[PDB]
Amino acid sequence: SGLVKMSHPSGDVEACMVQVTCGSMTLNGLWLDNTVWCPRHVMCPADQLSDPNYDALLISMTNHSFSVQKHIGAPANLRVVGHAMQGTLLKLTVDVANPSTPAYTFTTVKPGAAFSVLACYNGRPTGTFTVVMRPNYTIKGSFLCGSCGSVGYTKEGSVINFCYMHQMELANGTHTGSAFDGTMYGAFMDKQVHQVQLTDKYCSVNVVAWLYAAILNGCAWFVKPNRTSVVSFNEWALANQFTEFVGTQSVDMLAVKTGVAIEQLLYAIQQLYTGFQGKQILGSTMLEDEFTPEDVNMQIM
Amino acid sequence: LVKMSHPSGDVEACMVQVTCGSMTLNGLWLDNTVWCPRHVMCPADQLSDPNYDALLISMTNHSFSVQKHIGAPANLRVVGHAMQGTLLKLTVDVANPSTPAYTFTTVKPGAAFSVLACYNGRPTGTFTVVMRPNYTIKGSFLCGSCGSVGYTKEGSVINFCYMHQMELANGTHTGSAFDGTMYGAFMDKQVHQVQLTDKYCSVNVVAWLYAAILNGCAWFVKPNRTSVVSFNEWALANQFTEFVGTQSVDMLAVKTGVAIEQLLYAIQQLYTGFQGKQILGSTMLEDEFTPEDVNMQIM
Numbered sequence: 001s002g003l004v005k006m007s008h009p010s011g012d013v014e015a016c017m018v019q020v021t022c023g024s025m026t027l028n029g030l031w032l033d034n035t036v037w038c039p040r041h042v043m044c045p046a047d048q049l050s051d052p053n054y055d056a057l058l059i060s061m062t063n064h065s066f067s068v069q070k071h072i073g074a075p076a077n078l079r080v081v082g083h084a085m086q087g088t089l090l091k092l093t094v095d096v097a098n099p100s101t102p103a104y105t106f107t108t109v110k111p112g113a114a115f116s117v118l119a120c121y122n123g124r125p126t127g128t129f130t131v132v133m134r135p136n137y138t139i140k141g142s143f144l145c146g147s148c149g150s151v152g153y154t155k156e157g158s159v160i161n162f163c164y165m166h167q168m169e170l171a172n173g174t175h176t177g178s179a180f181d182g183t184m185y186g187a188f189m190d191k192q193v194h195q196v197q198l199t200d201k202y203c204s205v206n207v208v209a210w211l212y213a214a215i216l217n218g219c220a221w222f223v224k225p226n227r228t229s230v231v232s233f234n235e236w237a238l239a240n241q242f243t244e245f246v247g248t249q250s251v252d253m254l255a256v257k258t259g260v261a262i263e264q265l266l267y268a269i270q271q272l273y274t275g276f277q278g279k280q281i282l283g284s285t286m287l288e289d290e291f292t293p294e295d296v297n298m299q300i301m
Numbered sequence: 302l303v304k305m306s307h308p309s310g311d312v313e314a315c316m317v318q319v320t321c322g323s324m325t326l327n328g329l330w331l332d333n334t335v336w337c338p339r340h341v342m343c344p345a346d347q348l349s350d351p352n353y354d355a356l357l358i359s360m361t362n363h364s365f366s367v368q369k370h371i372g373a374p375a376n377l378r379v380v381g382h383a384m385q386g387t388l389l390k391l392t393v394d395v396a397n398p399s400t401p402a403y404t405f406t407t408v409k410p411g412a413a414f415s416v417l418a419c420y421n422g423r424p425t426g427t428f429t430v431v432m433r434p435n436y437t438i439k440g441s442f443l444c445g446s447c448g449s450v451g452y453t454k455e456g457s458v459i460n461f462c463y464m465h466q467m468e469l470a471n472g473t474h475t476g477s478a479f480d481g482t483m484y485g486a487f488m489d490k491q492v493h494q495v496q497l498t499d500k501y502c503s504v505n506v507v508a509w510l511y512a513a514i515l516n517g518c519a520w521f522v523k524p525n526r527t528s529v530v531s532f533n534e535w536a537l538a539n540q541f542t543e544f545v546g547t548q549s550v551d552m553l554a555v556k557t558g559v560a561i562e563q564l565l566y567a568i569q570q571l572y573t574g575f576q577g578k579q580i581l582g583s584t585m586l587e588d589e590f591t592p593e594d595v596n597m598q599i600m
């Protein structure tokens with residue numbers, strides 16, 4: 001009866017959320033050890049959103065320009081003792097290590113990969129959901145005003161990978177932000193100006209996983225004997241709004257558990273892209289690229 | 302238009318593992334009380350036709366083991382067992398110091414709650430579901446997930462409303478409310494049981510279309526309207542649920558300035574077909590977004 005949008009348990013990340021106020025601006029921050037991360041446009045005045053001088057605002061700030069507050073669970077007094085800038089991010093040093101700092105890394109997500117988001121307002125976690133990083137380096141989330149600094153992450157074993165900190169909503173209801181190295185996803189600009197996003201594409205490898213998920217659940221009308229090579233598919237994909245397909249051991253696993261080759265689904269996808277002939281697949285009349293091979297392997301097992 | 306769970310940090314602090322003999326599953330530790338499915342007691346021999354009263358009579362307090370694997374690790378001593386419907390209510394020696402402010406309420410079809418899926422007493426995933434009119438949920442559960450808890454938060458109060466018990470013939474799921482009753486009156490026995498044919502959640506299709514109007518999709522909206530009571534009667538034969546208005550529904554009718562009755566006329570129109578057109582990229586009726594979702598996400 002299909003998968004669900006599964007996100008990781010947010011408790012590790014909840015204990016890390018704080019409010020950062022600078023001047024007129026209030027937004028969320030991520031407190032790990034003696035560091036609080038937050039978008040650097042917390043420095044920007046309300047008048048100069050269109051094109052800020054970020055280097056002039058940082059020279060203009062002091063440790064006393066920033067307040068940090070922890071409201072949820074174990075509360076604390078947090079005093080900023082250093083400030084620095086890293087791409088589109090601020091790196092605030094505070095005088096207290098977070099006593100609930102999880103094991104963590106900073107790795108950038110590539111398009112098609114999924115991750116959990118905790119949506120916070122004024123330092124208060126309010127909801128969690130999962131997104132996939134689209135090929136145009138945007139995500140389809142739920143972000144209202146005040147959600148900036150909200151964090152995206154995945155967890156593997158004991159280690160959380162922080163991959164995303166929320167910065168802006170584009171003209172469509174589409175969102176984007178930074179990785180924790182400071183770069184913005186998509187090389188968008190942290191300035192209120194017109195930025196036109198490239199076209200969204202189908203994440204071919206996640207389409208295949210979803211098709212495998214249908215096959216494991218008894219829905220296999222789309223499977224035929226015919227096949228399309230990875231190389232033919234990747235040529236057709238260039239000309240049809242599809243990402244290039246790179247196989248992984250998670251896909252291979254589904255190929256094995258099912259008896260249906262990757263190439264059969266590559267051919268299937270070329271057919272289904274045109275239309276479903278009025279039939280459904282796992283309750284959809286469209287292709288589904290928002291579940292990964294890892295999602296399918298973990299939820300149907 | 303996204304599916305959003307509550308932050309699960311509060312519930313994670315109450316998850317525990319409960320072992321009775323060879324069977325293990327998840328419990329919910331609150332105060333001195335640990336709730337879990339009673340079928341922890343059922344040996345594999347009795348899975349098809351379990352006598353729980355007999356199984357219960359056979360248990361001492363020492364037949365049960367409660368382990369806390371996450372947070373402040375510990376072993377709790379079981380000092381009391383009782384059965385409450387399809388749930389086991391054990392009494393332990395230590396009161397959970399992270400016991401949140403909680404209530405126990407039964408959710409009604411169409412209502413959305415958050416599920417914390419756990420395995421061996423360890424949370425592994427969170428998701429949201431709406432309770433279906435056949436009193437099932439379209440979840441994602443595997444072996445060992447029994448005891449995983451669904452809940453809503455009204456401000457600071459956690460309302461525990463679901464404890465997972467079983468997968469049906471379809472990949473569809475049910476469990477117990479914390480009064481101990483099973484949703485859909487399904488039985489805690491390993492026998493093929495029959496879901497009632499599902500219906501659409503009428504109050505949630507309305508909300509879905511109030512989101513469309515809010516997000517520039519008013520094609521279906523006609524000045525033609527149908528009463529609640531007439532739709533209701535129609536709904537009982539076209540597999541739709543009974544519409545019960547709410548405050549949140551009224552706000553989606555206030556600031557889009559559309560009347561509820563118009564949508565209830567549309568939905569009888571679009572149940573036959575969409576005329577080929579699409580609402581928010583969909584060819585069919587959507588019933589798993591609630592008025593509170595729409596209100597919260599399109600403020």
Ligand SMILES: *C(=O)[C@@H](C[C@@H]1CCNC1=O)NC(=O)[C@H](CC1CCCCC1)NC(=O)c1cc2ccccc2[nH]1
Nearest residue numbers: 041049143144145146147148167168169171190191192
């Ligand atoms: C953070 O708390 C922000 C997130 C967005 C608010 C609503 N939903 C969101 O995701 N808010 C912002 O307003 C962001 C402000 C800074 C951007 C970087 C430079 C300094 C200002 N601005 C926008 O997201 C934004 C872009 C828009 C284009 C068209 C209409 C509205 C827009 N808002």
Ligand SMILES: *C(=O)[C@H](C[C@@H]1CCNC1=O)NC(=O)[C@H](CC1CCCCC1)NC(=O)c1cc2ccccc2[nH]1
Nearest residue numbers: 340442443444445446447466467468469470489490491
């Ligand atoms: C709790 O730890 C589980 C979780 C199951 C595992 C697979 N997917 C789930 O949700 N529940 C079970 O193992 C139950 C056993 C209970 C049955 C009633 C008596 C109490 C124990 N079995 C099922 O849930 C179930 C559904 C189903 C459909 C078709 C064939 C078998 C089958 N078993």
